[PDB]
Structure formats: C-alpha cells, structure tokens
Write a protein that binds this ligand. Structure first.
Ligand SMILES: *Cc1cc2c(cc1C)nc1c(=O)[nH]c(=O)nc-1n2C[C@H](O)[C@H](O)[C@H](O)COP(=O)(O)OP(=O)(O)OC[C@H]1O[C@@H](n2cnc3c(N)ncnc32)[C@H](O)[C@@H]1O
Ligand code: HEM
Ligand SMILES: O=C(CC(=O)C(F)(F)F)c1cccs1
Ligand SMILES: O=C(CC(=O)C(F)(F)F)c1cccs1
Ligand SMILES: O=C(O)CC[N+](=O)[O-]
Ligand code: SF4
Ligand code: F3S
Ligand code: FES
Lengths: 239, 613, 102, 138
C-alpha cells in the first residue's frame, strides 16, 4: 500500500459565494497510473467526479493538460507523480489566467493572439496554388525543426512574468515563436510585413529574456531563443 | 425543461467536429461562400488527428514513378472486397491534388533532395497492381504528420468567416420528416442549450475506440456522431469491423506509428523469431493491419510473450541508424521513453495489438451524403453529410490501409463541401423548425444532470469496456460473442441506475462524460451484435467458427460454370444496424457493396480474389 | 511603415555597450571629457531603463502618461545636476577617486 | 469574428464576472535565472536612484563635494564600515554590470539554452563577488 497525497485547487462557479481553495485527495499509487493525469482521472472516477479539467490524448501531443504541477507548468499526462509519499503534490491552474472552473482556464485571449499573426502560408501569387507542390530544399526545411512541433499548451506563455503583467498586449512566447516559424519558412512571401506587425512597444518587446518559457516547455522547445532571433531580424530588415 | 433557456442560431451549413475532416469541410464551405458554423466539444487543435504520425497517401511519384490506380488497387484489395470501389476510385484519384493542396496551405512536409514532398513505404502498398513491388507514396511531416495536418488546416481556417462554436457538445440532429435541419448542442461554458439550424449538416465526429478497455485513441473518441445518427433512427454501417493496431504499448495503449516498420523496424517474439515472415513471406512485417496483428495476438497464445506475464511482444528499431530514428521517427522516441522508458536507438519498444481505427460509421455516398435503406435500395437523407472516421463511405471496407485515413479526412471533407456548393447556393431558404425541436435531447440532458442512481458513470463505462475487450477482440466465436451481446445489452439496461454527482451548469465534465457513455453504448451494441451475426472471416473480423470468406461465388477457383449464391446467402455485403433507443434492441439488415468504379475506362473494377500478403 | 520600436531597442543596446566601454575608459583616463560623456550615457541609459519598468508595471492611459512625464523630469534634473557638478565642482571621476582613498 | 473582436469579447466577459485569477508568483517554482532576472531590475533601479540622488543633491544642497567628504571624514568612520559601505555600492553596480554583459550576449542570440543558462548565471555570480571585494579594496 502506497498512499500519495494530492492538494488540488478548486472553485465552483455555480456555488454562491464559493472562494478558491485547496482540496486534498489520497490515492493508492499501486492502483493507479504513473502520470499525474492518471491520478486526476482516478479521483475523478472514484473519489469526486466534480473535479473538472481538460484532457484528451493522454499521450502528450494535443496539449489539453497544461496546468501547474508543483510550481511548474507542464502536461499532466507526461509528468510522472512523485513516488515520495512524504511530499504532497500541488496542482494549480495555469498561472495568471481567469479560472472558468477548477483547473480549467480561459484560453480565449491566447488563441485570439495566435490568430493575429496569421499562422498560415502567404504567397504573393495565389493564382497557382493547389496544382503543384512548392519546392523546399531539406536545408530550408531544417530551419523549421524545433518550431513546428509546438502543441500550443500555453504552458510557456502562462509562465512568463511579462505575459502575467501584460498578457493583453504582449503576444507571449508561444505566439511569438510561431510568428517566427512563419517568418523563416522559405515558402512564405510576407516576412517583411510579419515583422512590421511587431513594430510597437508591447507585441514583442515586453520580453526581457527571463527564459521561464523555454525552461518549462513540455516539448523541450525554445521560445526565448526564437524571440531573440525575431528581435535580431527586427533590427536588421530593410524598408 | 425550460430551466435551460435555448438560443437559436441560423446558418447555411453546420459542421460537427473540427478534426481533419470537419476542419476541411468547414473552411471548404466558407471558401465556397456559405455562412458556415462549426461545432466542436474540443479546441480544434486538440482533435484526435493530432496524434496521427504515419502520414497521408498520394501517388505523387516523388520517390519513383507511380499511378494513383495502383493506389486504387491496393486499397480495394486491402478492404477484402467489402469496400465500395466507386468511393475508393474517387479518393485515390483526388489524393495527389489533395496532398498538394495541403502542402500549398503550408504543411511542413519532409523534403527530398529534389525539394519535393518526401514519401515512404507503408503497410501493403505495391506497384504495377501488386506486381511491381513495394511502393513509396506515404507523404509525411517527419513523424508528426497528423499534428501538422490539423494545425495547418486550423490555421488556414482562421482565414475565413466561419463561426466556430468552441467546446460545444452536440446532443442530437434536428430531424424533421426525414430531413436534417441542423443540430442542438450544449455550451459547456455556461451550460446553455443552442439550436444551430441550417440547410445542410456535416457529421465529422470521429470514431468510438473508447468503447473498449485498451485503445490508441484519446478519451474523447466516444462516437458521439454515430449515436446521433442512431438516435435519429438512421442506420450505421459495418460497426463490427474494428481495426486492431499491431504496435501499442502494453501500458496506456499509446500508439507507435506503423511508420517504424515501414522505415525499417521489425517485430520480434520471445523466441526471437521475426514471425512476421512466417505468417506472411512477401509482405512480412509490412502487411495489412488486420493480418499483422492477427499474427502477434496469436503468438501470445502459443505462449511467446516478451515480458513478465508474456502478454505482449517486442517492436524493434535498434538496427536502424540513430540519425534515421531522429529524422523519421522522433515522435515515437519521445513517448516510447516517456511511457515505456526506452532508448529506441539501442532497445526495442514493447507493443501489443490494441483497438485503433473504426472502418464502420455513418452510411455514406462517395459524395459524402448520408444513406438510409428503403426497400433494399439506397436513399439520400436530405441535408445530411458525414466524413472521416465517423463516416462509412467505406473506402476502407473490412480493413483500412495504413495512411489512408488522413487522406480520407481531407478528400471527403472536401467532397462534402463540394456536394453542398454544387447542389445549392448560400442564402437559400433555411428549413423551418418546430418550437419544440430538440426537446427530447434537453430532457435527457436534465435527467442525467441530476441522476441519483446507484451506479457511477465510471463504473458502468468500465463494465462496457472490459466486456467488449473480452468478447469482441481480435478473435471471436458465437459463444463468446453471444455472451457478450446479452452482457452488453445488460449494461445498457443499467443506464437508468447511473449516479452523477456534479450538478452545476459550468463545465460539468461529469454530465458530458455520462452523455458520452450513452453514446459509447449505442456503438457497442451495434458492434458486438453485427459481429455475432457475421458468420465469415473478412478483414479485421475473424471468426473461429467460420474462417471462410463467404462471397457470392468461390473466387478461388474459376467462375462461369459456378452458380451465384443468393444475396441473403453470402456475406459480401455491408452490415446495416439500428437500435430502439428506449430498449436497446438491435435490428439489422444489409445492402450490396458497390463494385463498379466511376469510369471503367479510367479505372477498371477489381474482382474479388484470394486474401493474402 | 516606421520602425520606431525596433530602433529604440537597438539604441538601448548601443548606449549599453557605450556605458560599458566608458567605465574602464574613465579609470585609465580620468578627464573632464570622460565626466561628461559618462554623465550622458549614465543618465540616458537609466532613463530608457526606468522607462521599460514603467510601461511594464503602470497600467492605464492616465498614469503611464504621467509616469513617463515625471520620469523625464527626474532624468533632466539628473543630467543637469551632473553637468553642474562637472562644471562647478570636482567632476564625477575625481569625486569617485577622492571618495575611495577615504 | 476577427482576432481583435475576440480579444474585446474576452475582456468584457472576464472583467465583468466572479471569475478568479489563478495564483502565480505565490505558486511558481523559483529558478536561478528568474531570481537573477529580478535582481537585474532591482539593481538597475537602485543604481539609477543613486545617480539621480547624486545629480539632484548637486543642484539643491549647498557646499562642494569636499565640504561633504570632510563632513564624513569627521564622523568616526570605522574602517570595518568604510569598507562595508564601499562594498554595498560596488556590489549592485558589478552584478548589474556582469549580468548586463550576459544580457547583451543573449541579444546576439547566444547562450540561450537551459544548460548554457545556468553556467553563465553561476559565472556572472562569481565575477560579481570577485570584482566587488576586489574594488572594495582599490
Ligand atoms: C487514434 C489514432 C489514429 C490514427 C493515428 C494515431 C492515433 C493515436 N495515426 C495515423 C497515421 O499516422 N496515419 C493515418 O493515415 N491515420 C492515422 N490514424 C487514424 C486517423 O488519424 C483517424 O481515423 C482520423 O484522425 C479521424 O479524424 P476525424 O476528423 O474524423 O476525427 P477526430 O480528429 O477524431 O475529431 C473528432 C472531432 O469531432 C468533434 N466532436 C466529437 N464528438 C463531438 C460532439 N459530441 N459534439 C461536438 N463535437 C464533437 C471533436 O471535438 C473533434 O473536433
Ligand atoms: C556596466 C555598464 C552597464 C551595462 C553593460 C548595462 C546593461 C544593461 C542591459 C543589457 C539592460 C537591459 C536588460 C533587459 O533586457 O531587460 C540594462 C537595463 C537597465 N540598466 Fe543597465 N547597464 C550598465 C550600467 C547601469 C548603471 C550604472 C545603471 C544605473 C544608473 C543602470 C540602470 C539600468 C536600468 C534601470 C535598467 C532597466 C532594467 C529593466 O528593464 O527593468 N545600468 N542595463
Ligand atoms: O583612481 C580612481 C578612478 C577610477 O578608477 C574611475 F575613474 F573612477 F573610473 C579611483 C579611486 C578610488 C576608486 S576609483
Ligand atoms: O516584472 C517582472 C517579473 C518578476 O519579477 C517575477 F519573475 F515574476 F518573479 C520582471 C521584468 C523584467 C525582469 S523581472
Ligand atoms: O493505422 C494504421 O494501421 C497505420 C498508421 N499509423 O501510422 O501507424
Ligand atoms: S512552446 Fe512549448 S510550452 Fe510554449 S505552447 Fe508550444 S509546446 Fe507549449
Ligand atoms: S519567459 Fe518571457 S520574457 Fe521572454 S524569454 Fe520567455 S518570453
Ligand atoms: S491530454 Fe493531451 S497532452 Fe496531455
């Protein structure tokens, strides 16, 4: 028998005067999975099915898990529980975000921001699209490795202090990296205008190279490193 | 009722599901000029297609010379002739244009030295009609093609005026005199009810793997779309044909792309034999999914497991250059380590055949239109379409060819949009709706909402899953099947003794997961029953009682002096299933499979032959 | 369009490397000239510095506008005060010098 | 609906509701980089405050710098205090200095990896102490 303690954040919108509070749960780790999500699902089906949270692939590629586990933003279905029965796991919603209910945050602004960078290929001549496959050397293609794997969990952005203070006007790591993903795609023809879109004091420049984003990506990606590349382009492109 | 205020929306077309299929259907409809609405219970990007790794088939001819017709042949054969050749014709011929469309959309395909889309080998795909040798037409974005496919499609959709109802649960179809008027859904955010009515509705809700205990699919694959069609009294097709994927971690059941095998990896039993060379010499490790798993699953029986309880097998990739596993299978390396703790570059991954894909679904036209059966004849259900895994135009038949689903998604997602754009104009009259339409759905909602029963939703779901897992697995027989049917029909009865705890209006995952249970059940009933009735062995469906391929004729020997068996005397036909929502009584019928193509001159029909790889 | 945001960014870096080269330069060669350029970069750099902290924490049109204003003042009285010191006094360099051998 | 309209909807919905903000600084795990990030500001701020105090004092207060120094000399200045105060001034300046150099290197796009990050942090921290004690004795 191996009992593990779980402290979980909670808040019911449909319970008059309810206020954010931690509810502790106990689970026999022998009767459970290795990941944190397994625990969540377990207390969900046996202890309290009022516990609400997003999940889907439980494989670590859809990005539904995004939540703060023991002070860090990661994917509940990939972060293995701490077998140290002495420690009590602390599960909170993604940082500085409006809570819809329990561990479920409102990512509307997040998504909206992603939309503002126009995350899609843009050619100056779209009259011939759909008939021939565009060419791209394997070299030009390697430049995308580490950029296109983004799952959009919002773990990085939601870990950035600048995003915490100015999430309304500051695009955040996640979005900024994707903007970069499209900036260096040899097939896109709007690099110049993509950079010009960041010509203000908030969209890009709220980033002070804190590096929490990169230090928390569940996919081992590097937003910060990308933000820096953008900045360099921003100060050297012409017209 | 009326405790839940209803909001009425009005559009030209509605798309239920934001997966590859749904997404392509949605923006494809807007691109055409229709005011389209798209309902999804998940953020489009969370859709299951993200998990896709293998790739998407298309005879582009980037690796060598190719002919979409060879793709046609391979697909119809892989369906064990239960696949409608007219749809298979349309799919394979459109494949190239469809894949190039994706690349032009921005999909980051892996490249060749010529700068073209990189394609690779995959399960049972040859050249010159099975004579030319192993084919290489599986286009792919490294090892995360699905994830890239969904993302680019989503991105591309932001470019249009489509209204996306995010995190909305479709409850039922708004039917009226055999015609679809739209859908009624539950806004998970505030628990309100919305009746989105339109002139056309497209169902792309994915599969229902979750009906089982161990599957590669996400917790969200609950066949909610199939259920709706079922609740409307419409038929569902070949729900028994469930595809069991060979490679699936003994643990959570996560998948390890078949691309591993196509890239070079192999399968090894305890004794160390490459069994997949004994059961199938030519194709070997790279043969049909239905056969390759049927093999492993068997080896486990003889007593040749590769772990503690000798219940699974071992997938090998070790002998492949470490770099190749980094450029062609980086996605599996991660999860292989995370869920198994292995260094693919120096150790084989522990896999076991687990539920994976559903060939069955909503009866469809090669144009995506839903079909109903009247007087033994097909009839188009006005204003109702279906595409993707949830649909059954049946281009997969009795067995889906690897890398053909993503193609299916894009091809028919487009087909649905085109069929609507070609049959009507935006702004046309949107059918009326009775002021009480959907009342049944809301009531059922309100019911489960305050369920004070004795059985917990999770408990019941768990009963259904393990029952399906034991009675309707890779192998089956009348005994095991019948005990399963009554066993499952028994659980269906318990749906009235279920207990729910959460009772709020906001994000009641307790309420929805239950609603999903109701759906999963309707799918299980039709899967297990249609399975017991089918007394023959075709594709994924393998009966011990009848290890035979009962066709109209005996295609092994010649045909001419031989007599054709009556339609109701052979099994080369689709299974049509229904069910009384109130009693769970399954009634079923059958309809012929289409053998003629769209043009004999351009693509000849392939007569049934012997199944073998 | 105008690339104001990017140019300001680079400007900061520039005076940053400049104020970085002055400290050493001011040691090896103390002189009235050094005391002035050292006062220019010292105050400028600091001005843009606090600026970032302001746009970062001060929310609202009203406040930020005022904050920026008050900041500009402080900077002005600071550069002037330093130039005064370099003119009618020892100068920052010799002041540092004196202050240490104490 | 456009990206902008979506953002407008977002704020209008949340600001006018009983929805709580999930905790942040109170729960996020501290990391050397994050801590060193805070200190850069703090020091930068404290450092500017000092410079301003020196400039403004030069405009409002009477007497010359020497009038002020001699004023301190005759203040029982304890050696193990003249060094202390001298260190306290050199510490924030040096830290900010070195970390600043690191910041510039990053702008060039170098050393932006978790591994490289911790190394540089330690280095900058060491250089700080050395240059501080070193200068407090010049
Ligand atoms: C499970 C699986 C399948 C798979 C694969 C890997 C895994 C883990 N890898 C593949 C590969 O490499 N190559 C290939 O050719 N196929 C592969 N597959 C099979 C294939 O991916 C699937 O068959 C296909 O992705 C299914 O796509 P589809 O678009 O039909 O469905 P979905 O992505 O599963 O999305 C379902 C959508 O419907 C919405 N939905 C569902 N229920 C509701 C309700 N009730 N209300 C509203 N919306 C609903 C979902 O939210 C979703 O958007
Ligand atoms: C040794 C010379 C110096 C160098 C190389 C240097 C470098 C830098 C750099 C690179 C930044 C930007 C950090 C970021 O990206 O957020 C910065 C910010 C700043 N510096 Fe300096 N600096 C130096 C001296 C000083 C001095 C003497 C002062 C005090 C008057 C000062 C005050 C500030 C302030 C207030 C900021 C703003 C920090 C913020 O954004 O919150 N610096 N410095
Ligand atoms: O002789 C000098 C001058 C010097 O280093 C500076 F000019 F300030 F840069 C110093 C004496 C004591 C501390 S600094
Ligand atoms: O405002 C913040 C964040 C901060 O102190 C925290 F990171 F949140 F701890 C900072 C801005 C620039 C450097 S730190
Ligand atoms: O679904 C299949 O059978 C093969 C594709 N997937 O990549 O492994
Ligand atoms: S970069 Fe990394 S954390 Fe930030 S969303 Fe993309 S996956 Fe997540
Ligand atoms: S935390 Fe932020 S501040 Fe820059 S580096 Fe990562 S975006
Ligand atoms: S549920 Fe999909 S990533 Fe964790």
């Amino acid at each position: 028998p191996r009992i593990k303690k779980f402290a979980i954040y909670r808040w019911d919108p449909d319970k008059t005067g309810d206020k954010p509070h931690m509810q502790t749960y106990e689970i026999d780790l022998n009767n459970c999975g290795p990941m944190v999500l397994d625990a969540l699902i377990k207390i969900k089906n046996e202890i309290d099915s009022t516990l609400t949270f997003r999940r889907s692939c439980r494989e670590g590629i859809c990005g539904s898990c995004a939540m703060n586990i023991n002070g860090g933003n990661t994917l509940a279905c990939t972060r293995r529980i701490d077998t140290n029965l002495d420690k009590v796991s602390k599960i909170y919603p993604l940082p500085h975000m409006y809570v819809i209910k329990d561990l479920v945050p409102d990512l509307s602004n997040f998504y909206a921001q992603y939309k503002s960078i126009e995350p899609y290929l843009k050619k100056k001549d779209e009259s011939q699209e759909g008939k021939q496959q565009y060419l791209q050397s394997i070299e030009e293609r390697e430049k995308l490795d580490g950029l296109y794997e983004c799952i959009l969990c919002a773990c990085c952005s939601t870990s950035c202090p600048s995003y915490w203070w100015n999430g309304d006007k500051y695009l955040g790591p996640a979005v900024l990296m994707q903007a970069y993903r499209w900036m260096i795609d040899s097939r896109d023809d709007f690099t110049e205008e993509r950079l010009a879109k960041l010509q203000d004091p908030f969209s890009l420049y709220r980033c002070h190279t804190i590096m929490n984003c990169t230090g928390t990506c569940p996919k081992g990606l590097n937003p910060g490193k990308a933000i820096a590349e953008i900045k360099k382009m921003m100060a050297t492109y012409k017209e | 009722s009326t405790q839940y205020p209803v909001v009425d929306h009005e559009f030209d077309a509605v798309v239920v599901g934001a997966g590859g299929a749904g997404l392509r259907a949605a923006f494809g409809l807007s691109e055409a000029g229709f005011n389209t609405a798209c309902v999804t219970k998940l953020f489009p990007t969370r859709s299951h297609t993200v998990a896709a790794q293998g790739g998407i088939n298309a005879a582009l001819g980037n690796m060598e010379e190719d002919n979409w017709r060879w793709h046609f042949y391979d697909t119809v054969k892989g369906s064990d002739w239960l696949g409608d050749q007219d749809a298979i014709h349309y799919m394979t011929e459109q494949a190239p244009a469809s894949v190039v469309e994706l690349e032009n959309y921005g999909m980051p395909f892996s490249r060749t030295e010529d700068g073209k889309i990189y394609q690779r080998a995959f399960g049972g795909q040859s050249l010159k009609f099975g004579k030319g040798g192993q084919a290489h037409r599986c286009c792919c974005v490294a090892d995360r093609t699905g994830h890239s496919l969904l993302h680019t499609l989503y991105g591309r959709s932001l470019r249009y005026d489509t209204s996306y109802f995010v995190e909305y649960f479709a409850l039922d179809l708004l039917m009226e005199n055999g015609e679809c008027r739209g859908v009624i859904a539950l806004c998970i955010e505030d628990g309100s009810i919305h009746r989105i009515r339109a002139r056309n509705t497209v169902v792309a809700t994915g599969g229902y793997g979750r009906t089982y205990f161990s599957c590669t699919s996400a917790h969200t694959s609950t066949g909610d779309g199939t259920a709706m069609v079922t609740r409307a009294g419409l038929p569902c097709q070949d729900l028994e044909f469930v595809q069991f994927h060979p490679t699936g971690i003994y643990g959570a059941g996560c998948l390890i792309t078949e691309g591993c095998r196509g890239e070079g990896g192999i399968l090894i039993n305890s004794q160390g034999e490459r069994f997949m060379e004994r059961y199938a010499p030519v194709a070997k490790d790279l043969a049909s999914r239905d056969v390759v798993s049927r093999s492993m699953t068997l080896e486990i029986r003889e007593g040749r497991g590769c772990g503690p309880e000798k219940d699974h097998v071992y997938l090998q990739l070790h002998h492949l250059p470490p770099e190749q596993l980094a450029v062609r299978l980086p996605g599996i390396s991660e999860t292989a380590m995370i869920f198994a703790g292995v260094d693919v570059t120096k150790e084989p991954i522990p896999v076991l055949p687990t539920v994976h894909y559903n060939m069955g679904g909503i009866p469809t036209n090669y144009k995506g239109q839903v079909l109903r059966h009247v007087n033994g004849q097909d009839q188009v259900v006005p204003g109702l379409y279906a595409c993707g895994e949830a649909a059954c135009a049946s281009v997969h038949g009795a067995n889906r060819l690897g890398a053909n689903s993503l193609l299916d998604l894009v091809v028919f997602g487009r087909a649905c949009a085109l069929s609507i754009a070609e049959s009507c104009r935006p702004g046309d009259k949107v059918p009326s709706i009775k002021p009480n339409a959907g009342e049944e759905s809301v009531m059922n909602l309100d019911k489960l909402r305050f369920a004070n029963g004795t059985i917990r939703t999770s408990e019941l779901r768990l009963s259904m899953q393990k029952s399906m897992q034991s009675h309707a697995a890779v192998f089956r027989v009348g005994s095991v099947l019948q005990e399963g049917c009554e066993k499952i029909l028994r659980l269906y009865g318990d749906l009235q003794h279920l207990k729910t705890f959460d009772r709020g209006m906001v994000w009641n995952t307790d309420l929805v997961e239950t609603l999903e249970l109701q759906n999963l059940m309707l799918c299980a009933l039709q899967t297990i029953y249609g399975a017991e009735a089918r007394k023959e062995s075709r594709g994924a469906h393998a009966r011990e009682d009848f290890k035979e391929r009962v066709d109209e004729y005996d295609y092994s020997k010649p045909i001419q002096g031989q007599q054709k068996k009556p339609f109701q005397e052979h099994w080369r036909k689709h299974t049509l299933s229904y069910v009384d929502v109130k009693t769970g009584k399954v009634s079923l019928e059958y309809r012929p499979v289409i053998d003629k193509t769209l043009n004999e001159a351009d693509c000849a029909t392939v007569p049934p032959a012997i199944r073998s790889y | 369009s105008s690339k104001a945001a990017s140019l300001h960014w680079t400007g900061e870096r520039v005076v940053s490397v400049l104020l970085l080269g002055l400290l050493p330069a001011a040691y090896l060669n103390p002189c009235s000239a050094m005391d002035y350029s050292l006062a220019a970069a010292l105050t400028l750099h600091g001005h843009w510095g606090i600026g970032q902290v302001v746009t970062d924490y001060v929310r609202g049109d009203a406040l930020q506008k005022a904050a920026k204003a008050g900041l500009l003042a402080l900077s002005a009285f600071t550069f002037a005060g330093l130039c005064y010191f370099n003119y009618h006094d020892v100068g920052i360099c010799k002041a540092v010098a004196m202050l240490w051998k104490l | 609906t456009t990206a902008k309209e979506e953002m407008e909807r977002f704020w209008n919905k949340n600001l006018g509701s009983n929805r709580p903000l999930s905790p942040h600084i109170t729960i996020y795990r501290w990391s050397l980089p994050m801590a060193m990030s805070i200190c850069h500001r703090g020091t930068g701020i404290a450092l500017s405050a000092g410079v301003s105090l020196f400039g403004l004092s030069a405009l409002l207060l009477p007497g010359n710098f020497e009038s002020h120094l001699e004023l301190v000399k005759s203040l029982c200045l304890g050696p193990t205090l003249i060094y202390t105060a001298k260190f306290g001034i050199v510490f924030p300046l040096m830290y900010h200095t070195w970390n600043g150099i690191r910041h510039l290197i990053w702008d060039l796009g170098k050393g932006l990896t978790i591994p490289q990050l911790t190394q540089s942090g330690v280095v900058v921290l060491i250089l700080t102490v050395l240059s501080s004690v070193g200068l407090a004795a010049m």
